[PDB]
Amino acid sequence: HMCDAFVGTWKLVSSENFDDYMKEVGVGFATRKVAGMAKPNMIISVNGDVITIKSESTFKNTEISFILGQEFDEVTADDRKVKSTITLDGGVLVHVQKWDGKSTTIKRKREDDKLVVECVMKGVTSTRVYERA
Numbered sequence: 001h002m003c004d005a006f007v008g009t010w011k012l013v014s015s016e017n018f019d020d021y022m023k024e025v026g027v028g029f030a031t032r033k034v035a036g037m038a039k040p041n042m043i044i045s046v047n048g049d050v051i052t053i054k055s056e057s058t059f060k061n062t063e064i065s066f067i068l069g070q071e072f073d074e075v076t077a078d079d080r081k082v083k084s085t086i087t088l089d090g091g092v093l094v095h096v097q098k099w100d101g102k103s104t105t106i107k108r109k110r111e112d113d114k115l116v117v118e119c120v121m122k123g124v125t126s127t128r129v130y131e132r133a
């Protein structure tokens with residue numbers, strides 16, 4: 001019952017600062033433009049201790065499966081090869097990515113009927129809001 005309130009199909013309804021977040025991460029111009037136009041659906045499911053997060057859009061379809069607190073290797077939609085760990089901290093899913101001596105954190109929280117995604121790297125934050133599909 002770990003993530004019950006996150007499970008479901010979610011659609012992007014708003015974004016702020018995502019281009020600048022992507023610049024900070026190191027994403028190149030063409031990828032930023034196409035990725036920034038995407039309107040992904042995020043599909044979260046749980047089977048036993050394994051959580052699966054899928055993101056589907058015209059830009060890219062991604063899927064990660066993981067156990068909380070157990071590191072895994074991830075190829076991000078922008079083609080970084082990162083080492084990721086996802087934990088629950090006070091009801092917030094905290095997804096940390098480490099690569100090339102750098103780090104970024106993606107937090108996912110339930111707030112009212114929304115799922116709010118906050119992405120941070122070195123003072124650059126982006127907030128992306130999803131609603132149930």
Ligand SMILES: O=C(O)c1csc(Cc2cccc(Cl)c2)n1
Pocket residue numbers: 022025027035040055076077078106117119128
């Ligand atoms: O709400 C989302 O769609 C989301 C937040 S963070 C992330 C992962 C990422 C970072 C930089 C470039 C790209 Cl294309 C993807 N995807």
